[PDB]
Design a protein around this ligand. Structure first.
Ligand code: ZN
Length: 850
């Protein structure tokens, strides 16, 4: 059935149906009940702060943070009134209506609703259903006149709370019992969510096209409906019990400049989609696939052995057998035995993991989102009113075509849609900072954790390529594509639920055994000591305090750090001396016209062995290999992409494990199949190796080059802010008569300097992407290929010897198979970057390379 969204006010009475007093999983049967509203079937909204595992003091902003990743905003007063709770409800209703306004989101919701948790746990015997567990059953309190008195159990799929202490930290939580999680083991379980629709993340698009302003790179706020949908994909993964853990991406923390973060799971990167799944190696891709498939084999074994329900005799065995068949897409034969169809499972697995994706959804709803999970995140903002249809609609969100806001996501642009958001007071924002001290005169700088380089540790990547391989007659090789055509997902019928939803009513919960997570704050500051002045210092030397009036530019970095009226500039000597020039009022307009024009010329500097090089990057940042000293062009011309890297990573290139070939005496066909299966497995290992190199490149090198791009945007903005301050000061120095006659437009100066910046960032983008790809193609790929050419020779020797040891059992085609092995192992698999990315910008850089 088509997805129905319910309507209700917070003040509406308890009907024991769509509005109930509920005992949530982490309440632990302690007599605490919450007013819960059924927004859709199996999904409940509770307009209350998420308190479980926290302390009351946590809801206030202190000197600590919960997550090093996040710019955390605190507000204890959020949701402290009945009216505030009603707003929350109405906004959630509105967001859910926006989700189902397009088919794709409707599919996501219908799959959540119908993806009921398996009536069991790992502790539950294979022959039984059990609804007496916290991941399946939730309790409601009935309050009527003197006739019936008790608790009553209902089935639920998703319970949505208000935020925890951190308003903008939306999280989806799964239920753990006895150190294990049902939502990671094929069963599935009641998913919980803490959510706040009003405080949204901010991102930027620093890697784009167009040299004109058109308000490029000015900042973009996120669409609350997309954020919710990101969490709904987690909910989906959890209800299908496929939200598994494998080898995570763990940040390297052995250097001061390296970013600090918790481990990043593949489930998180699959959810985001886009370029990110390529950061999860093909070995780990298969590992996750196998664990999911094995879990599904457990459930299919359970359904074939299930006969009774222990908790409730009112539970109809056939109804739930028919529903779990419909949920997991099993096939039933003649006798009634359920089994797994691989073609069904793969379609299901790929739709849940690679179909429903933040990138796929955003690109279908015409909503701008960040480029990667590894994109820098700016300070969050408050959306004034989401219920205001002149600002935010169900159909089009922020990008409303009547307001001329649809074109290029203008409705999300911070510089255009000023009236949609309010900036947040930094007194309420907690940010994980690194206090950096350089060697009376000791200089300290508070540096955001977000502005540090993300570099994946060596232990992030799998070594499964080094393991041996048993090649038998039925050995099947796999490629799991980190892609799924979105139009096929929208039009697919097999994923739509066939069997009707069972009634939510059941027996009350008596077993309250649950693992509740515990959260504590850590200090938000860390002091480091170092000898090197790098980017953080060089960027800071381009800033000035707000009280300083007569600032002047300097090409001396030391003088800029020491003098607070001195600001470091990386442009030419002529630009600096022109900017520090004091003229009579009559020639001022000419000077403003000259210096602004000079800024644009200086920023657009790019002389022309591939693509174009921007020469001031070294002076601007001093990134990597002391690039501010000497001449950057010369230093690049010798070494190349390397000099810009702050850290040269240790590459993981495993020696490919030997193939062990099975013998089949008096069976010709099984000998021929084995030789064939070994050659197809060779292609798999080549593809996997390429995937391992790309995985490391994206998370260890390409991220460093992204930080340089973000550094250059800041550096160029600092130079514009310095020039604007100088012009403004020089303007105000004149008399009131003088100011009147020779006037300039401050909006004109802003837009012109901004347009030069976008043109410059374009040049830097082109150059840096060139560096990144160049590094992959020169310093990474060849080394992998070299070990694959060793593996080929080893396999050549192995297969040829195998043919000899079996020459009599073939006879008719021994020389045929020998020439088959010879020619197939001369075909080297071509490396194609289009398999891993869809950026087009990086695709062309790869194509230009010979
Ligand atoms: Zn997530």
């Amino acid at each position: 059935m088509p997805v129905t969204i319910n309507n209700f006010n917070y003040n509406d009475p308890i009907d024991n149906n769509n509005i109930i007093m509920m005992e949530p999983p982490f309440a632990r049967g302690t007599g605490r009940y919450y007013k819960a509203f059924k927004i859709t079937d199996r999904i409940w909204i509770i307009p209350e702060r998420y308190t479980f595992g926290y302390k009351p003091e946590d809801f206030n902003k202190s000197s600590g943070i919960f997550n090093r990743d996040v710019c955390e905003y605190y507000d204890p007063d959020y949701l402290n009134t009945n009216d505030k709770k009603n707003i929350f409800l109405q906004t959630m209703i509105k967001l859910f209506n926006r989700i189902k306004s397009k088919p794709l989101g409707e599919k996501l919701l219908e799959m959540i609703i119908n993806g009921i948790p398996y009536l069991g746990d790992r502790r539950v015997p294979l022959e039984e259903f059990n609804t007496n567990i916290a991941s399946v059953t939730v309790n409601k309190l009935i309050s009527n006149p003197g006739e019936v008195e008790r608790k009553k159990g209902i089935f639920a799929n998703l319970i949505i709370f208000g935020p925890g202490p951190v308003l903008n930290e939306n999280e989806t939580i799964d239920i753990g019992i006895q150190n294990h999680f049902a939502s990671r083991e094929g069963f599935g379980g009641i998913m919980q969510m803490k959510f706040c629709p009003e405080y949204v993340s901010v991102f930027n698009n620093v890697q784009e096209n167009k040299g004109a302003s058109i308000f490029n790179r000015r900042g973009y706020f996120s669409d609350p409906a997309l954020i919710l949908m990101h969490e709904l994909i987690h909910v989906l993964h959890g209800l299908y019990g496929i939200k598994v853990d494998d080898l995570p991406i763990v940040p390297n923390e052995k250097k001061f400049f390296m970013q600090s973060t918790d481990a990043i799971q593949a489930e998180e990167l699959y959810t985001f989609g886009g370029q990110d799944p390529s950061i999860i190696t093909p070995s780990t891709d298969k590992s996750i696939y196998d664990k999911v498939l094995q879990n599904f084999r457990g459930i299919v074994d359970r359904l074939n052995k299930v006969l009774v329900c222990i908790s409730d005799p009112n539970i109809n065995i056939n109804i739930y057998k028919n529903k779990f068949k419909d949920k997991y897409k099993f096939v039933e034969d003649s006798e009634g035995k359920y089994s797994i169809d691989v073609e069904s499972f793969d379609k299901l697995y790929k739709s849940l993991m690679f179909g429903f994706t933040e990138t796929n959804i955003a690109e279908n709803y015409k909503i701008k989102t960040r480029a990667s999970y590894f994109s820098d995140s700016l300070p969050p903002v408050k959306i004034k009113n989401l219920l205001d249809n002149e600002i935010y609609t169900i159909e089009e969100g922020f990008n409303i075509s009547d307001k001329d806001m649809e074109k290029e996501y203008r409705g999300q642009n911070k510089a255009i849609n000023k009236q949609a958001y309010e900036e947040i007071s930094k007194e309420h924002l907690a940010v994980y900072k690194i206090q950096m001290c350089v060697d009376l005169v000791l200089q300290c700088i508070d540096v955001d954790n977000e502005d540090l380089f993300f570099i994946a540790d060596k232990n992030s990547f799998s070594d499964d390529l080094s393991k041996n391989e048993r090649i038998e007659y039925n050995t099947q090789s796999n490629y799991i594509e980190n892609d799924f055509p979105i139009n096929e997902l929208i039009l697919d019928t097999d994923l739509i639920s066939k069997i009707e939803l069972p009634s939510e009513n059941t027996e009350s919960l008596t077993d309250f055994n649950v693992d509740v997570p515990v959260y504590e704050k850590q200090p938000a500051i860390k002091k480091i000591f170092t000898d090197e002045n790098t980017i953080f210092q060089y960027l800071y030397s381009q800033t000035f305090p707000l009280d300083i009036r007569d600032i002047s530019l300097t090409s001396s970095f030391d003088d800029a750090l020491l003098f607070s009226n001195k600001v470091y500039s990386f442009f030419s000597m002529d630009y600096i001396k022109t900017a520090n020039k004091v003229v009579e009022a009559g020639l001022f307009a000419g000077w403003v016209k000259q210096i602004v024009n000079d800024f644009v010329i200086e920023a657009n500097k790019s002389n022309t062995d591939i693509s174009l090089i921007v020469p001031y990057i070294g002076l601007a940042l001093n990134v990597g290999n002391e690039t501010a000293k000497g001449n950057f062009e010369n230093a690049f011309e010798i070494a190349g992409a390397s000099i810009l890297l702050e850290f040269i990573p240790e590459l993981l290139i495993p020696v490919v494990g030997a193939f062990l070939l099975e013998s089949y005496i008096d069976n010709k066909n099984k000998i021929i199949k084995t030789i064939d299966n070994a050659l197809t497995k060779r292609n798999e290992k080549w593809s996997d190796m390429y995937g391992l190199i790309v995985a490391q490149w994206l998370s260890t090198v390409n991220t460093q080059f992204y930080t340089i791009k973000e550094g250059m945007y800041k550096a160029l903005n600092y130079q514009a802010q310095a020039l604007e301050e100088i012009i403004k000061y020089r303007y105000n120095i004149y008399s009131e008569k003088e100011k009147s006659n020779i006037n300039i437009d401050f909006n004109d100066i802003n837009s012109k300097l901004n347009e030069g910046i976008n043109q410059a960032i374009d040049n830097i983008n082109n150059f840096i992407n060139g560096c990144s790809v160049s590094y992959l193609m020169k310093k990474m790929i060849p080394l992998a290929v070299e070990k694959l050419l060793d593996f080929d020779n080893t396999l050549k020797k192995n297969l040829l010897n195998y043919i000899d040891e079996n020459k009599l059992y073939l006879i008719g085609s021994a020389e045929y198979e020998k020439s088959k092995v010879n020619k197939y192992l001369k075909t080297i698999m071509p490396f194609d970057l289009s398999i891993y990315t869809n950026d087009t910008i990086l695709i062309e850089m790869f194509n230009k390379y010979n």
